[PDB]
Design an enzyme around this catalytic site. Structure first.
Site, PDB file in Angstrom:
ATOM      1  N   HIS A 161      50.171  27.171  31.735  1.00 19.00           N
ATOM      2  CA  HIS A 161      50.372  27.369  33.894  1.00 19.00           C
ATOM      3  C   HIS A 161      48.965  27.364  34.287  1.00 19.00           C
ATOM      4  CE1 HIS A 161      50.162  30.058  36.793  1.00 19.00           C
ATOM      5  NE2 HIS A 161      50.911  30.857  37.190  1.00 19.00           N
ATOM      6  N   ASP A 185      46.871  28.455  36.404  1.00 14.46           N
ATOM      7  CA  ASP A 185      46.290  29.338  36.217  1.00 14.46           C
ATOM      8  C   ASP A 185      45.242  30.137  34.687  1.00 14.46           C
ATOM      9  OD1 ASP A 185      45.960  30.268  39.075  1.00 14.46           O
ATOM     10  OD2 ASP A 185      47.240  31.412  38.971  1.00 14.46           O
ATOM     11  N   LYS A 186      46.650  29.399  34.305  1.00 16.11           N
ATOM     12  CA  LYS A 186      45.964  29.864  32.948  1.00 16.11           C
ATOM     13  C   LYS A 186      45.317  29.138  31.669  1.00 16.11           C
ATOM     14  CE  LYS A 186      46.472  34.464  31.430  1.00 16.11           C
ATOM     15  NZ  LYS A 186      44.374  34.012  31.224  1.00 16.11           N
ATOM     16  N   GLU A 238      33.259  29.037  37.214  1.00 17.01           N
ATOM     17  CA  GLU A 238      34.775  28.518  37.392  1.00 17.01           C
ATOM     18  C   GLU A 238      35.285  27.079  37.322  1.00 17.01           C
ATOM     19  OE1 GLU A 238      35.487  31.670  37.476  1.00 17.01           O
ATOM     20  OE2 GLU A 238      33.965  32.306  39.197  1.00 17.01           O
ATOM     21  N   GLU A 294      27.618  28.535  37.433  1.00 21.07           N
ATOM     22  CA  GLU A 294      26.354  28.825  37.796  1.00 21.07           C
ATOM     23  C   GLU A 294      26.334  29.270  35.260  1.00 21.07           C
ATOM     24  OE1 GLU A 294      27.556  31.504  39.620  1.00 21.07           O
ATOM     25  OE2 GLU A 294      27.406  30.190  41.168  1.00 21.07           O
ATOM     26  N   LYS A 302      56.593  30.813  33.171  1.00 16.95           N
ATOM     27  CA  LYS A 302      56.311  32.444  33.231  1.00 16.95           C
ATOM     28  C   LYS A 302      57.808  33.292  33.346  1.00 16.95           C
ATOM     29  CE  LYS A 302      54.121  32.799  37.588  1.00 16.95           C
ATOM     30  NZ  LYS A 302      54.104  32.834  38.844  1.00 16.95           N
ATOM     31  N   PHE A 334      62.972  22.339  37.021  1.00 19.58           N
ATOM     32  CA  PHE A 334      61.377  22.804  36.642  1.00 19.58           C
ATOM     33  C   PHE A 334      60.802  21.216  36.312  1.00 19.58           C
ATOM     34  CE2 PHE A 334      58.563  26.478  35.319  1.00 19.58           C
ATOM     35  CZ  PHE A 334      57.203  25.647  35.519  1.00 19.58           C
ATOM     36  N   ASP A 370      51.091  22.978  41.159  1.00 19.88           N
ATOM     37  CA  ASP A 370      50.582  23.900  41.970  1.00 19.88           C
ATOM     38  C   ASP A 370      49.230  23.932  41.188  1.00 19.88           C
ATOM     39  OD1 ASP A 370      50.614  26.762  42.861  1.00 19.88           O
ATOM     40  OD2 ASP A 370      51.154  27.190  41.042  1.00 19.88           O
ATOM     41  N   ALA A 371      48.229  24.721  42.567  1.00 16.74           N
ATOM     42  CA  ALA A 371      46.827  24.217  42.281  1.00 16.74           C
ATOM     43  C   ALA A 371      46.749  25.706  40.833  1.00 16.74           C
ATOM     44  CB  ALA A 371      45.579  24.354  42.861  1.00 16.74           C
ATOM     45  N   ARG A 417      42.570  34.488  38.820  1.00 15.46           N
ATOM     46  CA  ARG A 417      43.981  34.865  39.596  1.00 15.46           C
ATOM     47  C   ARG A 417      45.344  34.533  38.904  1.00 15.46           C
ATOM     48  NH1 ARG A 417      44.140  31.614  44.879  1.00 15.46           N
ATOM     49  NH2 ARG A 417      45.915  32.215  44.141  1.00 15.46           N
ATOM     50  N   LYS A 418      45.383  35.524  37.597  1.00 15.41           N
ATOM     51  CA  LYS A 418      45.948  35.904  36.436  1.00 15.41           C
ATOM     52  C   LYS A 418      45.247  37.463  35.797  1.00 15.41           C
ATOM     53  CE  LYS A 418      49.642  33.807  36.972  1.00 15.41           C
ATOM     54  NZ  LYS A 418      48.852  33.728  38.412  1.00 15.41           N
ATOM     55  N   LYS A 444      32.946  33.959  31.608  1.00  7.92           N
ATOM     56  CA  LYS A 444      31.824  34.951  31.564  1.00  7.92           C
ATOM     57  C   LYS A 444      31.132  36.029  30.651  1.00  7.92           C
ATOM     58  CE  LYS A 444      33.987  36.492  36.598  1.00  7.92           C
ATOM     59  NZ  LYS A 444      34.113  37.769  36.909  1.00  7.92           N
ATOM     60  N   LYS A 489      27.823  39.791  32.424  1.00  4.87           N
ATOM     61  CA  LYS A 489      29.281  40.034  33.523  1.00  4.87           C
ATOM     62  C   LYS A 489      29.999  41.062  33.320  1.00  4.87           C
ATOM     63  CE  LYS A 489      27.496  36.547  34.376  1.00  4.87           C
ATOM     64  NZ  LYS A 489      25.763  35.820  33.749  1.00  4.87           N
ATOM     65  N   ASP A 510      32.424  43.530  34.639  1.00  8.40           N
ATOM     66  CA  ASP A 510      33.492  42.382  34.873  1.00  8.40           C
ATOM     67  C   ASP A 510      34.587  42.662  33.797  1.00  8.40           C
ATOM     68  OD1 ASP A 510      33.746  42.801  37.713  1.00  8.40           O
ATOM     69  OD2 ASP A 510      33.574  40.748  37.915  1.00  8.40           O
TER      70      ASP A 510
HETATM   71  C1  LIG Z   1      56.557  28.599  41.978  1.00 10.70           C
HETATM   72  S1  LIG Z   1      54.733  27.697  42.384  1.00 10.70           S
HETATM   73  C2  LIG Z   1      53.650  28.544  43.422  1.00 10.70           C
HETATM   74  C3  LIG Z   1      53.723  28.099  45.021  1.00 10.70           C
HETATM   75  C4  LIG Z   1      53.395  27.088  44.837  1.00 10.70           C
HETATM   76  N1  LIG Z   1      51.963  26.170  45.356  1.00 10.70           N
HETATM   77  C5  LIG Z   1      53.949  26.181  46.284  1.00 10.70           C
HETATM   78  O1  LIG Z   1      53.626  24.836  46.547  1.00 10.70           O
HETATM   79  O2  LIG Z   1      54.970  26.545  47.173  1.00 10.70           O
HETATM   80  C6  LIG Z   1      53.891  29.286  40.890  1.00 10.70           C
HETATM   81  C7  LIG Z   1      54.167  28.501  39.325  1.00 10.70           C
HETATM   82  O3  LIG Z   1      55.498  28.379  39.546  1.00 10.70           O
HETATM   83  C8  LIG Z   1      55.692  27.537  38.031  1.00 10.70           C
HETATM   84  N2  LIG Z   1      56.565  26.862  38.961  1.00 10.70           N
HETATM   85  C9  LIG Z   1      56.104  25.772  39.553  1.00 10.70           C
HETATM   86  N3  LIG Z   1      56.983  25.068  40.106  1.00 10.70           N
HETATM   87  C10 LIG Z   1      58.394  25.232  39.528  1.00 10.70           C
HETATM   88  C11 LIG Z   1      59.570  25.000  39.987  1.00 10.70           C
HETATM   89  N4  LIG Z   1      59.602  23.936  40.270  1.00 10.70           N
HETATM   90  N5  LIG Z   1      60.675  25.879  39.630  1.00 10.70           N
HETATM   91  C12 LIG Z   1      59.997  27.784  38.816  1.00 10.70           C
HETATM   92  N6  LIG Z   1      58.401  27.748  38.965  1.00 10.70           N
HETATM   93  C13 LIG Z   1      57.874  26.579  39.528  1.00 10.70           C
HETATM   94  C14 LIG Z   1      54.292  26.961  37.844  1.00 10.70           C
HETATM   95  O4  LIG Z   1      54.075  28.331  36.845  1.00 10.70           O
HETATM   96  C15 LIG Z   1      53.327  28.011  39.542  1.00 10.70           C
HETATM   97  O5  LIG Z   1      52.044  27.149  38.364  1.00 10.70           O
HETATM   98  C1  LIG Z   2      25.955  39.107  41.278  1.00 11.27           C
HETATM   99  S1  LIG Z   2      26.945  37.343  41.650  1.00 11.27           S
HETATM  100  C2  LIG Z   2      27.997  37.160  40.110  1.00 11.27           C
HETATM  101  C3  LIG Z   2      27.584  36.523  38.779  1.00 11.27           C
HETATM  102  C4  LIG Z   2      27.018  35.025  38.878  1.00 11.27           C
HETATM  103  N1  LIG Z   2      27.869  34.097  39.302  1.00 11.27           N
HETATM  104  C5  LIG Z   2      26.000  34.502  37.972  1.00 11.27           C
HETATM  105  O1  LIG Z   2      25.672  33.836  37.643  1.00 11.27           O
HETATM  106  O2  LIG Z   2      24.929  35.720  37.523  1.00 11.27           O
HETATM  107  C6  LIG Z   2      28.471  38.092  42.548  1.00 11.27           C
HETATM  108  C7  LIG Z   2      27.785  38.179  43.512  1.00 11.27           C
HETATM  109  O3  LIG Z   2      26.922  39.813  43.816  1.00 11.27           O
HETATM  110  C8  LIG Z   2      26.213  38.995  45.323  1.00 11.27           C
HETATM  111  N2  LIG Z   2      24.799  38.296  44.834  1.00 11.27           N
HETATM  112  C9  LIG Z   2      24.374  36.727  44.386  1.00 11.27           C
HETATM  113  N3  LIG Z   2      23.708  37.267  44.192  1.00 11.27           N
HETATM  114  C10 LIG Z   2      23.044  38.117  44.454  1.00 11.27           C
HETATM  115  C11 LIG Z   2      21.599  39.224  44.270  1.00 11.27           C
HETATM  116  N4  LIG Z   2      20.371  38.414  43.860  1.00 11.27           N
HETATM  117  N5  LIG Z   2      21.369  40.561  44.266  1.00 11.27           N
HETATM  118  C12 LIG Z   2      22.859  41.447  44.031  1.00 11.27           C
HETATM  119  N6  LIG Z   2      24.249  40.784  44.768  1.00 11.27           N
HETATM  120  C13 LIG Z   2      24.041  39.171  44.681  1.00 11.27           C
HETATM  121  C14 LIG Z   2      27.329  37.829  45.383  1.00 11.27           C
HETATM  122  O4  LIG Z   2      28.035  38.644  46.468  1.00 11.27           O
HETATM  123  C15 LIG Z   2      27.656  37.557  45.044  1.00 11.27           C
HETATM  124  O5  LIG Z   2      28.911  36.897  45.148  1.00 11.27           O
HETATM  125 CL   LIG Z   3      51.140  31.483  40.022  1.00  5.31          CL
HETATM  126 MG   LIG Z   4      51.546  29.485  46.406  1.00  2.00          MG
HETATM  127 MG   LIG Z   5      29.910  35.911  37.498  1.00  2.00          MG
END
Ligand SMILES: C[S@@+](CC[C@H](N)C(=O)[O-])C[C@H]1O[C@@H](n2cnc3c(N)ncnc32)[C@H](O)[C@@H]1O
Ligand SMILES: C[S@@+](CC[C@H](N)C(=O)[O-])C[C@H]1O[C@@H](n2cnc3c(N)ncnc32)[C@H](O)[C@@H]1O
Ligand SMILES: [Cl-]
Ligand SMILES: [Mg+2]
Ligand SMILES: [Mg+2]
Ligand SMILES: COc1ccc(-n2cc3cnc(NCC(F)(F)F)nc3c(-c3ccc(Br)cc3)c2=O)cc1
Ligand SMILES: COc1ccc(-n2cc3cnc(NCC(F)(F)F)nc3c(-c3ccc(Br)cc3)c2=O)cc1
Ligand SMILES: [Cl-]
Ligand SMILES: [Mg+2]
Ligand SMILES: [Mg+2]
Ligand SMILES: [Mg+2]
Lengths: 385, 385
Positions: B19, B21-22, B47, B60, B171, B240, B248-249, B254-255, B275, B279, B281
Site C-alpha cells: 500500500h 502509505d505503508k 518523511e 531532518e 487493503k 485493480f 494513489d500517492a 497516513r496509516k 522518528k 520523538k 510521538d
Molecule cells: C482508492 S485509492 C484513494 C483514492 C484516490 N486517490 C483517487 O484518486 O480516487 C486508496 C487506496 O485504495 C487502493 N486502490 C487503489 N486503486 C484501487 C482500485 N482500482 N480498486 C480498489 N482499491 C484500489 C490502494 O490501496 C490505494 O492506496
Molecule cells: C519540534 S518539530 C518535530 C521534530 C523535528 N522534526 C526534529 O527534527 O526534531 C514539530 C513542530 O514543533 C514546532 N517547532 C519547530 N521548531 C520548534 C522549536 N525550536 N521550539 C518549539 N517548537 C518548535 C513546529 O510547529 C513544528 O512543526
Molecule cells: Cl488509503
Molecule cells: Mg484520496
Molecule cells: Mg519528527
C-alpha cells in the site's frame, strides 16, 4: 494537583495556520477549491509536501478546470503570512513542484463511471466516526476548542501588529479537569497549557512569556478555569526562530486529530484535505459529525459517537452504530432506527445534503473542521420519529 | 443482521506492505534503522512521499552515520515486491530524490544539547494513548488483528507463488459483532469483510473472488465466526490493475490508526515511522502500550486506556490518566499510583527500558506496531504494589 474521584484529566492540541502540516492541508484544499470553482464534479486527491523552500503537489486530479497551480499555491502561502526569507519561507520565491496525474481509470470505473450520482460508490473503503458533546454550545470538547482559540489569537495579534515578533508557525496544548455527569462531562479547570510559537531574532524569552500569558491566554481562557495551580509551559524549548517548513517537514493529513475532536470520540484514520466528496474519508466523517450533532441538539443524547464504514465501489455504508455513553433514555437500537429514518449516508446523497461541491474547503483546513462557522454539517437536522 | 441488546458492531481496517502509505512508513523506518546501525544517537525525522516512479525523502537528520539513501530506499522497495514496470513500480529504475537537512539547531538546543540522557526533553509537545484489551491473547482488538492477518496472508500467497496474479498493494476491513461483558468485550461473529488487492491483467474477477474467499479468508478467520449472513465485498471495485504509488500517492504517517488499535482506544495524532526515540510521538506511545498491556496481563484490568502528554523540552509527562472501562476493582487513583510507582515515562528512561536505539523499526512499519513479535513494549512489566 489532586484528582477527586469522579473527575479526570484530558488533553488536546492544536496548531496554527503556519504549522508546516497545516500549510499543506490549506494548500491541498486551495487546490480543491480552485478546481471546484470551474468543475463542480472534479475528482481531486491532492497531497502537499512542504520543506525548506519547497511546496510539492503529488496525487491525482481529473477535472475540466484549468488551474494555475503556481498562483493557487503561492496565494495560499501569502495568506498564511510567509512572505520573506527572514521568516524562513516566502511565497514569492519558493519552489512549487507538481507531480499530478489523472485519477486511476481503474478507480474511476469502479466508483463513478456511468453511475447515477446518488448511486456513486464510495471512493475507497474505510471507517469514520462522528462525535458530539453538550459541554460547549458548539458541541465540541473544551480542550480542543481552547487549543484552537489560542492559535487563532496568536494569528490575530501577529496580523494586527501588536506582537510583531510573532511568526505563523505555532502549537498549543490544553489539559482540562472534568467532572463525570451521567455519561456527559463538565469542565472544572484548566490544569496545564503549552504554547510554542515561532518568533523573530530580537525578542527575548521573558517578553514572549509575559505576552503569551497576559495577551494570549488571558484573552482566550475564562479566568474561572485558571488558578494558582495551573501549569504554564510557554516557549518551553527556549528558542523557536527557525520554523515553518524550514524547521520541520509538513505533509497533508498529518493533523487528523487536530482536525476532528482532539482525541475525544474516535478516529478512523482518514485525512480530509485535498479530497472531493466522493472520498468518504471526508464526506462520511462530515455526515457522521452532522448526525452526532443532530442527536445532541435534538435532545436525544448529551454525548454520542457514531461509526460508519464503506467498501470502495459500494454506495451504502456497510453498517452504522451509535454509542451514547449512557446519556440517552433511548436504546442504541432506537437511536439507530432514528438515524436510518432521517439520514441517507450514501456519498451521492451526502453531497446534496451538505452542498459538498461548493468551494469552501480551504476555510475548513485550519482551526478544526468541526464546531465553527455554521458549515452545513454544523446545522442540525430536525429529526422525525 | 439483527443486533441483540448488549451487543454492537465495530470495524477496523489494515493495509498491505505495498500500500503506498505503508511503503513510505517502511522506507522511513529503513532510513532510521540505517542511521541507528552506525550512530545509536542519530536524530532522525524522515518523511517519505511516493508517487508514480518516485520516492522522495524529506525531513531532518543529524547523525554521524554515512548512509547510502539510494541503496536503503531501493532495497526496501525490493523487499516489498515492486520489481518490474509491469507491476507499476520498480526498485531498480525508480527516481529517488532526497531533501534532507540537519535537525533545526533551535530544536536541538531545546531538547537534547548538553542534557543528561535521562533528562532529555520531549522532542515535541503532544498527546499519546496506550490501549489493551483481553479479548485476544496478544491484548489487541480482534477487528484489527484479523484485518492485519488477511493482508499478511495475501503477501504470503503472493510470495509463495500459489496466487501469482497478486501484487503488493492491498487493503482489508473487518466488522465484528461483540458482546458487552462488564466493560470488556467478547467477539461473537464477523459481520462484513472487505478485501481489495492489486492484480495482474490476466486473472478474471471470478477467479479472484473465489480465491480470496477460499484461500485467504478461510485460511485466516476461524469458521466459528463466519455464517451464512456474513457479508463479503471481495474486489468490490471490479478492477485493480493499476496500484501502488501509481494508483494513489503515499505519505509517511497516513496509516496511524492501522498502526495502532484500528479505531479502538484513542489516538493523539502522532505518526511513528521515521522518528528516533526522542520523538515522544513514537516512544511515549510505545511506553503507553507497554503500561496498558502490563495492567491487563498483570490482572488489574481487562480493558484499559492510558493518556500521556508532553511539552517540547520538558522530560516528564505533563500528566498521566488511566481509564479502565469498569474492568478493575481498583480505582483510577489506585491504578495511577501503581503506574507511577512502576514506570518512568521520561523519553530518556523509556529508551533504556524499551531498547529504542536498536535498529528494529522497519519491522514495526507494516501489520501494526502492537500485538506482535514480542517487541519490548509487548513484554509486560511485573508490577509491584
Ligand atoms: C482508492 S485509492 C484513494 C483514492 C484516490 N486517490 C483517487 O484518486 O480516487 C486508496 C487506496 O485504495 C487502493 N486502490 C487503489 N486503486 C484501487 C482500485 N482500482 N480498486 C480498489 N482499491 C484500489 C490502494 O490501496 C490505494 O492506496
Ligand atoms: C519540534 S518539530 C518535530 C521534530 C523535528 N522534526 C526534529 O527534527 O526534531 C514539530 C513542530 O514543533 C514546532 N517547532 C519547530 N521548531 C520548534 C522549536 N525550536 N521550539 C518549539 N517548537 C518548535 C513546529 O510547529 C513544528 O512543526
Ligand atoms: Cl488509503
Ligand atoms: Mg484520496
Ligand atoms: Mg519528527
Ligand atoms: C458516569 O459518567 C462518566 C462520564 C465520563 C467518563 N469518562 C471518564 C474518564 C476517566 N479518565 C479518562 N482518562 C483519559 C484516558 F485517555 F486516559 F482514558 N477518560 C475518561 C473518559 C474518556 C474515555 C475515552 C475517551 Br476517547 C475520552 C474520555 C470518560 O468518558 C466516565 C463516566
Ligand atoms: C458493560 O460493558 C460494556 C462493554 C462495551 C461497551 N461499549 C459498547 C458500544 C456500543 N456500540 C459502540 N459503537 C461503536 C461506535 F463507534 F459507534 F461508538 N461502541 C461501543 C463501545 C466502544 C466505544 C468507543 C470505542 Br473507541 C470503542 C467501543 C463500548 O465500549 C459498553 C458496555
Ligand atoms: Cl508536528
Ligand atoms: Mg469520548
Ligand atoms: Mg470510549
Ligand atoms: Mg475502546
Amino acid at each position: 494537583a489532586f484528582i477527586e474521584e469522579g473527575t479526570f484529566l484530558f488533553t488536546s492540541e492544536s496548531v496554527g495556520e503556519g504549522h508546516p502540516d497545516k500549510i499543506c492541508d490549506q494548500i491541498s484544499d486551495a487546490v480543491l477549491d480552485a478546481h471546484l470553482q470551474q468543475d463542480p464534479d472534479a475528482k481531486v486527491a491532492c497531497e502537499t509536501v512542504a520543506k525548506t523552500g519547497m511546496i510539492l503537489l503529488a496525487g491525482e486530479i481529473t477535472s475540466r478546470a484549468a488551474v494555475d497551480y503556481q498562483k493557487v499555491v503561492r496565494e495560499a502561502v501569502k495568506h498564511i503570512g510567509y512572505d520573506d526569507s527572514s521568516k524562513g519561507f516566502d511565497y514569492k520565491t519558493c519552489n512549487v513542484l507538481v507531480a499530478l496525474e489523472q485519477q486511476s481509470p481503474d478507480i474511476a470505473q469502479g466508483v463513478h463511471l456511468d453511475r447515477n450520482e446518488e448511486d456513486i460508490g464510495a471512493g475507497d473503503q474505510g471507517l469514520m466516526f462522528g462525535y458530539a458533546t453538550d459541554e460547549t454550545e458548539e458541541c465540541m470538547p473544551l480542550t480542543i476548542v481552547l487549543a484552537h482559540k489560542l492559535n487563532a489569537k496568536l494569528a490575530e495579534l501577529r496580523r494586527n501588529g501588536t506582537l510583531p515578533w510573532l511568526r505563523p508557525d505555532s502549537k498549543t496544548q490544553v489539559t482540562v479537569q472534568y467532572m463525570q455527569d451521567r455519561g456527559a462531562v463538565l469542565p472544572i479547570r484548566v490544569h496545564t497549557i503549552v504554547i510554542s510559537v515561532q518568533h523573530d531574532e530580537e525578542v527575548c524569552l521573558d517578553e514572549m512569556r509575559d505576552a503569551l500569558k497576559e495577551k494570549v491566554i488571558k484573552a482566550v481562557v475564562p479566568a474561572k478555569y485558571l488558578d494558582e495551580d495551573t501549569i504554564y509551559h510557554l516557549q518551553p524549548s527556549g528558542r523557536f526562530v527557525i520554523g515553518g517548513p524550514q524547521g520541520d517537514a509538513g505533509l497533508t493529513g498529518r493533523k487528523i486529530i487536530v482536525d476532528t475532536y482532539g482525541g475525544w470520540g474516535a478516529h478512523g484514520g482518514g485525512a480530509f484535505s485535498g479530497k472531493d466528496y466522493t472520498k468518504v474519508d471526508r464526506s462520511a466523517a462530515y455526515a457522521a459529525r452532522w448526525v452526532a450533532k443532530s442527536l445532541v441538539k435534538g435532545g436525544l443524547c448529551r454525548r454520542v459517537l457514531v461509526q460508519v464504514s464503506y467498501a470502495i465501489g459500494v454506495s451504502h455504508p456497510l453498517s452504522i452504530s451509535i454509542f451514547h455513553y449512557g446519556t440517552s433514555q433511548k436504546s442504541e437500537r432506537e437511536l439507530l432506527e432514528i438515524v436510518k429514518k432521517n439520514f441517507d449516508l450514501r456519498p451521492g446523497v451526502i453531497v446534496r445534503d451538505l452542498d459538498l461541491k461548493k468551494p469552501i474547503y480551504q476555510r475548513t483546513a485550519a482551526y478544526g473542521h468541526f464546531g465553527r462557522d455554521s458549515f452545513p454539517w454544523e446545522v442540525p437536522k430536525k429529526l422525525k420519529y
